[PDB]
């Protein structure tokens, strides 16, 4: 406590004086190995060292399985496929195994060599002393009453209007840049400039457009579409057909941008071309408005399900269900895709079909419902 005494205090009596200032009191602190000639101390300082040498031997192994190793990708039927498949496992059991063994070797230095000390420290929490509660409250209130702002009801009132009309300025400038209008007339249909959720790619651009029910030849985006005869499938063909507007075509870079706006940017385009077996037609219930939206045991319902919008692809050709893979709604394809299970509450939108004069499948226009998963402004 005075410089006349700190010149001769030992190192242990300065640790105790450093804890009286903070209230810290090490009650017990005894070294791990009090017996000098032990021979069990010598086999536990190597037991610590064997883990730290493994952390250096494995880090040296990680340096050499990173440089001197065939990291190149090799395909499945190649020669170096197995030796590639041990690249990233050898990046793990040489990186992670090193510091797992430096971590063990440093816990074992704490369990076995750093002396066990039990320290008690009085927490002074709960409540400040009165000489500190009062000299703050008499400093914040003097900074507010000495400021003479409470007597000035014109500065302090216009400041709240000033920071209010500025805070309303930024929070509209910061937010109003990204507040789009969802019902802005954009998509140029036959009725002329509808919204986005009311249009689906099956909506006709003019009166007699004759959208085709064209499938793809696998990997539908970059693949050219091809038309679909009604005799293509036999019994639950479930072929996905896309809106091919009979003038797009593939081969040139100008009219290859149309096919990516039908799939990879185009949601609510795909529909399922379900073919009901002719033996079970009496167990088919039409919908109220959608009575003749079929052409001879060919039904067209959307893949976009009526609850959160995953493409419902699984079909299970025996019993006419349209089971969706995400949340498993099980639309009953014989009953206008009324949901008979799951969280979905609405039917899939049925598309009308009529054969062309040449003999191809043509839609008779758009749906009755929007295909989307129940935005707030939907009629039903």
């Amino acid at each position: 406590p005075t410089d006349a005494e700190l010149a001769e205090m030992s190192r242990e009596e300065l640790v105790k004086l450093g804890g009286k200032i903070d209230g810290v009191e090490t009650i017990f602190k005894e070294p791990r190995w009090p017996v000098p000639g032990t021979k069990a101390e010598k086999r536990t300082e190597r037991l610590v060292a064997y883990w730290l040498m493994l952390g250096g031997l494995s880090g040296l192994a990680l340096l050499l399985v990173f440089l001197f190793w065939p990291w190149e990708y090799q395909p499945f039927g190649s020669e170096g496929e197995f030796l590639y498949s041990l690249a990233t496992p050898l990046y793990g059991l040489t990186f992670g195994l090193s510091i797992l063994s430096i971590g063990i070797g440093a816990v074992l230095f704490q369990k076995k060599f750093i002396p066990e000390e039990i320290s008690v420290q009085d927490r002074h929490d709960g409540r400040s002393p009165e000489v500190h509660r009062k000299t703050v409250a008499a400093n914040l209130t003097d900074a507010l009453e000495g400021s003479t702002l409470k007597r000035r009801k014109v500065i302090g009132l216009s400041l709240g209007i000033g920071l209010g009309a500025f805070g309303a300025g930024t929070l509209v400038a910061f937010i109003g840049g990204l507040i789009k209008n969802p019902w802005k007339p954009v998509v140029p249909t036959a009725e002329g400039k509808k919204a986005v959720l009311w249009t689906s790619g099956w909506t006709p651009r003019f009166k007699g457009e004759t959208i085709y029910l064209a499938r793809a030849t696998g990997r539908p985006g970059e693949s050219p579409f091809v038309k679909m005869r009604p005799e293509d499938i036999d019994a639950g063909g479930m072929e996905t057909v896309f809106p091919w507007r009979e003038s797009d075509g593939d081969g040139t870079t100008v009219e290859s941008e149309h096919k990516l706006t039908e799939i990879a940017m185009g949601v609510r385009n795909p529909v399922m071309l379900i073919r009901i077996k002719p033996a079970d037609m009496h167990r088919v219930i039409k919908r109220k408005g959608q009575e003749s939206f079929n052409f001879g045991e060919l039904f067209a319902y959307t893949k976009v399900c009526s609850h959160l919008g995953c493409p419902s692809s699984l079909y299970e050709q025996q019993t006419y269900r349209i089971l969706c893979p995400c949340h498993q709604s099980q639309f009953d394809a014989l009953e206008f895709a009324k949901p008979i299970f799951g969280p979905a509450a609405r039917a899939l939108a049925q598309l009308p079909i009529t054969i062309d004069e040449d003999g191809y499948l043509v839609a008779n226009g758009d749906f009755v419902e929007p295909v989307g998963p129940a935005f707030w402004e939907r009629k039903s």
């Binding site: 069990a40 990708y73 990186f95 195994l97 420290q121 919008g309 692809s313 995400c326």
Partner: protein, 536 residues
């Protein structure tokens, strides 16, 4: 010539003359932290947070976050000439065309799981031990925002590769749930995508939220979270010297700089093995995201799985109030904020129903709180049901039950199973309390029987205290501290004889070591005992 003794003092005097941190270093170098294994559960969420910063910065300068369509023309042979986004090509270039790039990518997904798992384990320490009651209320709230951010920070993470499995989660969550909101549901969808789904600006918005904003908030909340546990003197369990205004534990400089720095080396070591050995997110198997294909299922990571199961179990309940509609997806958006409101505002619910507004610094042992232990395991068993009902496309296929019967054990069980885990855990907790009173009133049940000379099989209890002139022991008082139930844990086992595992020490060096084991476990025992009597 190097010295490292005169240089250590001549440099420490240069710091303590320009600056003067010795009256401030010592007060945080004599800081005392309680040694208990539960108090290291929060460090797993911190040590996995740093690995997500370190492995994240690596693949931040390889990943390209756009949605511009581009053919692959690279090295992975099944994906050749495939129209993919640029975010999926530069996630197939990290995995395949960078040395050690799949490793850093896999560690970064496993550390994201260990981050979110060791939050849930750490919430379960705070909730059941009662580490939130009077001073720690704000540290619960600053805390529980890190759980809600880690749900969304991880969900914004694997949405970035634009995988087929991962893109249908965005169509479900961010386009199905956020479009059926009743006040404005379509206006919020255009303010998030810039148009209809998918759009062009989503994955760049989900890249800036995921690298700058939300880790900027999580790292700023953690710094406000660890300050409120450094400067509020970390809670402790009751015990021998633990008396509500002390912190009986170990200091910072010799110990807890070592056992907390070595524990960071092991949590990084576990994630180094898991990121190397175990494959995590093979995004090359399922192709690029295009809205005309699906996978065999769709489910999030395990932290966002309880929201997916919450979608699957609420039935097809819609209202149609006018020419509008209120879909099924709003029952989750109001059922996710209601779960988050009860979890943020819990320390203010319990003090309203109990009146427990006194300053608490000793943890409640969770058997001593039979209601909050039972309310907690009600909420685990509802989480464990909602996270197993989102993978009922796998329980149906691999466990052979049904696809219809798994929802009805998730619908009937959502009411039943939180109600019959409340009963069995309110009655587990009190039945642990009575086990602690049969060891105070009678003693530790030693196994040895000793048939008496007239029959009379007895059990020879060890009294754990003073004795009467009659053979019965004096009953002790319960004090919240864990009681031993087994006699080997009271040091009745002994030492196996020192030496190696195969060859013994010469037994003169054995009696000098085992004497120092009964004189350091006894000097420590008369240190807490003479300090416990100093307080009282």
């Amino acid at each position: 010539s190097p010295d490292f003794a005169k240089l250590a003092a001549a440099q420490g005097d240069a710091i303590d003359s320009r600056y003067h941190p010795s009256a401030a270093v010592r007060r945080q170098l004599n800081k005392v932290f309680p040694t208990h294994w539960s108090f290291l559960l929060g460090e797993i969420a911190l040590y996995s947070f740093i690995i997500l910063l370190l492995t994240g910065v690596w693949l931040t300068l390889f990943f390209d976050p756009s949605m511009a369509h581009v053919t692959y023309d690279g090295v992975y042979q099944p994906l050749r000439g495939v129209q993919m986004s640029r975010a999926y090509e530069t996630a197939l270039d990290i995995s395949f065309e960078v040395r050690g790039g799949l490793f850093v990518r896999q560690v970064h997904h496993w550390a994201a799981l260990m981050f979110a798992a060791s939050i849930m384990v750490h919430l379960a320490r705070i909730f059941f031990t009662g580490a939130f009651r009077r001073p720690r209320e704000a540290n619960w709230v600053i805390g529980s925002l890190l759980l809600i951010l880690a749900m969304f920070e991880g969900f914004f993470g694997y949405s970035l590769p634009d995988d087929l499995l991962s893109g249908t989660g965005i169509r479900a969550a961010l386009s199905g749930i956020t479009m059926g909101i009743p006040v404005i549901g379509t206006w919020m969808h255009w303010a998030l995508f810039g148009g209809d789904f998918p759009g062009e600006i989503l994955i760049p918005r989900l890249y800036a939220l995921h690298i700058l904003l939300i880790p900027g908030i999580i790292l700023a909340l953690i710094g406000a979270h660890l300050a409120l546990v450094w400067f509020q003197k970390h809670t402790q369990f009751p015990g021998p010297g633990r008396t509500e205004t002390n912190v009986v534990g170990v200091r910072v400089m010799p110990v807890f700089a070592v056992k907390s720095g070595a524990f960071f080396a092991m949590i990084t070591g576990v994630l180094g093995l898991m990121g190397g050995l175990l494959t995590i997110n093979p995004i090359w198997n399922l192709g690029p995201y295009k809205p005309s294909q699906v996978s065999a299922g769709s489910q999030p990571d395990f932290y966002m799985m309880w929201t997916d199961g919450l979608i699957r179990l609420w039935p097809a309940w819609e209202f149609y109030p006018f020419g509008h509609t209120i879909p099924q997806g709003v029952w989750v958006a109001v059922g996710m904020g209601l779960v988050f409101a009860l979890l943020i505002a819990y320390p203010f619910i319990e003090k309203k129903v109990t009146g427990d507004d006194a300053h608490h610094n000793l943890l409640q042992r969770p058997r001593d709180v039979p209601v909050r232990t039972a309310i907690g395991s009600m909420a685990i068993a509802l989480y464990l049901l909602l996270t197993f009902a989102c993978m009922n496309d796998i329980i149906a296929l691999k466990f052979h039950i049904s696809l219809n019967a798994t929802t009805w054990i998730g619908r009937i069980g959502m009411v039943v199973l939180p109600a019959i885990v409340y009963f069995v855990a309110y009655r587990w907790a009190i039945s642990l309390q009575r086990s602690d009173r049969e060891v105070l009133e009678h003693g530790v049940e030693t196994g040895i029987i000793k048939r008496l000379p007239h029959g009379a099989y007895v059990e020879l209890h060890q009294p754990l205290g003073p004795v009467d002139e009659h053979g019965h022991p004096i009953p002790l008082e319960y004090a919240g501290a864990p009681l031993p139930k087994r006699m080997n844990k009271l040091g009745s086992g002994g030492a196996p004889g020192t030496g190696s595992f195969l060859f013994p020490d010469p037994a003169v060096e054995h009696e000098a070591l085992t004497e120092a084991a009964h004189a350091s476990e006894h000097k420590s025992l008369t240190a807490l005992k003479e300090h416990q009597d100093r307080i009282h």
